[PDB]
Design a protein around this nucleic acid. Structure first.
Ligand SMILES: [Mg+2]
Ligand SMILES: [Mg+2]
Ligand SMILES: [Mg+2]
Ligand SMILES: [Mg+2]
Ligand SMILES: [Mg+2]
Ligand SMILES: [Mg+2]
Ligand SMILES: [Mg+2]
Ligand SMILES: [Mg+2]
Ligand SMILES: [Mg+2]
Ligand SMILES: [Mg+2]
Ligand SMILES: [Mg+2]
Ligand SMILES: [Mg+2]
Ligand SMILES: [Mg+2]
Ligand SMILES: [Mg+2]
Lengths: 101, 119, 73, 88
RNA sequence: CUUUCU
RNA sequence: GUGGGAGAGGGUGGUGGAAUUCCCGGAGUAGCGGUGAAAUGCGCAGAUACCGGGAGGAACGCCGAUGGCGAAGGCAGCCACCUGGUCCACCCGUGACGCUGAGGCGCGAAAGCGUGGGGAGCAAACCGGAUUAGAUACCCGGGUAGUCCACGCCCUAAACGAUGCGCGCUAGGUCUCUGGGUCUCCUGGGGGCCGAAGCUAACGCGUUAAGCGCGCCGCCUGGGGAGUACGGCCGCAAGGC
């Protein structure tokens, strides 16, 4: 099992209850696939460079997990299913490449 | 009839002609004019001068809908692009701004032989 | 030529592998989502190379433009 | 892939003595490993020719070390093979 | 635009 | 073997935005387009230009290069998975296990062929406009195969560095990509340029040899006839050797 980063962007017009609903299904998914959660980040809403799904804003997440490589792609399918889920991207972890430091 | 005041001024330049389309802040065209829209049938439709008469025309018909200030957009490369603008700027309208919003592809459709040999 | 000023100079120590530093990245783009050359990025082979890939990610997460319209002219 | 630990395990499993790494046996034993994995990777991706060459090269190198083995100690040979699972 | 032969 | 590294090397699955075409709705008229000049063509069943939505196909701008990777053909949106090659440091292990390579086997741009699928844009043939003395062309308007995918076949090429592979030896200077070190330099791998000696008919090559040498393979022996004929092998065919 290797470390990954799970960017996820959902509908920004979610009600705390509708929203809470998503973060839930996500947690299941992650779990169901072996996504051992190492830490999250609730950035919230930010100005997208371009409208996504007609919507001019977006609600970002970020779960750095440690799951089995052999799943990741399937996990990624599962995550995407959710309609209020706008975009999902799972980079592999990477020692930060400094610069001008 | 409508009366708008401010809106968009689309300048579609090319080496073959220049059509100018004035529209409301929603983008729904109010008035338009080409070069041939003023006689000029074949080649002359491209001359920078043609663009001038076009711009002006569309500008007039535009002020007829009560226009006053516009946001100019440009798309194309023609012996009349920057000129048509020279026109609108003058005319009687208030060109708030200018923008080149020509559409370029991040490489997709194979162009006609006429435009190939790119690479 | 283009000796106006470099993007690395007017900047600090940053992780060129950060596909979310929307603030720092925006710096390397031009008056369009277009990624800056080296004469401008001031970066280097290896760097300017990671920049590029990093930027593309941000773009995808809707964090950066792919192309901007040109004001003035 | 073949993880460090997973690999070294084989190295030990075949080394002639503590520290032995580049020994013909260890070596053959080692390539036999890679070869089989790749062999698999092509059970699928029959379309991946660029890797296939690599395969072709590993075999070459192997079917070569062995050649030398038999030539040398014809015993270690019979052993290694039967053990490793080759010939046929 | 094209524009052959000697 | 251990530990570091760069890469458009390859295979599968996803997936992002730009643009074109089409369909829908909005607003809007009289033209658009195209050329040297035009016409064909398309538009009042409302085109062009503009805004919104949708569908689909193919290709991935900037980064991007005098750049990188591969044995060659060749390879660039992003993500994961699977997988090949390779450079370096330590010098730790094996102990000549090496080089070349007739034949064989595999790979092999494009066009082409088979079965099925796909088809936006482009476009042999073709159907039209123009130009011309004529125009079976150049230019303009349409356009089928094809280009796309899968599986099977074909195997060619200015398949080029027009330069077989491996090793040793023979001034430097200069730029560059990638690793190491005591890091305005030294050192290794790769890509360029100018050049010692030397080689060359010359042009040029010159530690990335076309120099000095050894090993192994392929090949040449005046031009036309002709890569034809015949024979043989391969191929569904075209055709290939
Ligand atoms: Mg030793
Ligand atoms: Mg010994
Ligand atoms: Mg082929
Ligand atoms: Mg083909
Ligand atoms: Mg076919
Ligand atoms: Mg014709
Ligand atoms: Mg045509
Ligand atoms: Mg066409
Ligand atoms: Mg040099
Ligand atoms: Mg060198
Ligand atoms: Mg000399
Ligand atoms: Mg020279
Ligand atoms: Mg003869
Ligand atoms: Mg036969």
């Amino acid at each position: 099992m290797r470390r990954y980063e799970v960017n996820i962007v959902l509908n920004p017009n979610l009600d705390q209850s509708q929203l809470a609903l998503e973060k839930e299904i996500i947690q299941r998914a992650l779990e169901n696939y072996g996504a051992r959660v190492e830490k999250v980040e609730e950035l919230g809403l930010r100005r997208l460079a371009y409208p996504i799904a007609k919507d001019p804003q977006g609600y970002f997440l970020w779960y750095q997990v440690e799951m089995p490589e052999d799943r990741v792609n399937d996990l990624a399918r599962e995550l995407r299913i959710r309609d209020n889920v706008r975009r999902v991207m799972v980079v592999k972890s990477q020692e930060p490449f400094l610069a001008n430091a | 009839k409508r009366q708008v005041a401010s809106g968009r001024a689309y300048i579609h330049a090319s080496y073959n002609n220049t059509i100018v389309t004035i529209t409301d802040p929603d983008g729904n065209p109010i008035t338009w004019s080409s070069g041939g829209v003023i006689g000029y049938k074949g080649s002359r439709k491209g001359t920078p001068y043609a663009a001038q008469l076009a711009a002006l025309d569309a500008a007039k018909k535009a002020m007829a809908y009560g226009m006053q200030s516009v946001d100019v957009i440009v798309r194309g490369t023609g012996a009349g692009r920057e000129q048509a603008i020279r026109a609108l700027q003058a005319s009687g309208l208030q060109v708030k701004s200018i923008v080149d919003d020509t559409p370029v592809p991040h490489n997709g459709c194979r162009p006609k032989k006429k435009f190939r040999k790119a690479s | 030529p283009s000796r106006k000023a470099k993007v690395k100079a007017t900047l600090g120590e940053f992780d060129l592998r950060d596909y979310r530093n929307v603030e720092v990245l925006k710096r390397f783009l031009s008056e369009t989502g277009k990624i800056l050359p080296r004469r401008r990025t001031g970066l280097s082979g290896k760097e300017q190379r990671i920049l590029a890939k990093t930027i593309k990610r941000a773009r995808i997460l809707g964090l950066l433009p792919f192309t901007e319209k040109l004001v003035r002219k | 892939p073949i993880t460090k630990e997973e690999k070294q395990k084989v190295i030990q499993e075949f080394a002639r003595f503590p520290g032995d790494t580049g020994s013909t046996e260890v070596q053959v034993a080692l390539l036999t490993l890679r070869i089989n994995r790749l062999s698999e990777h092509l059970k699928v991706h029959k379309k991946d020719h660029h890797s296939h060459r690599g395969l072709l090269m590993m075999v070459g190198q192997r079917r070569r070390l062995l050649r030398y083995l038999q030539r040398e100690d014809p015993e270690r040979y019979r052993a290694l093979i039967e053990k490793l699972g080759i010939r046929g």
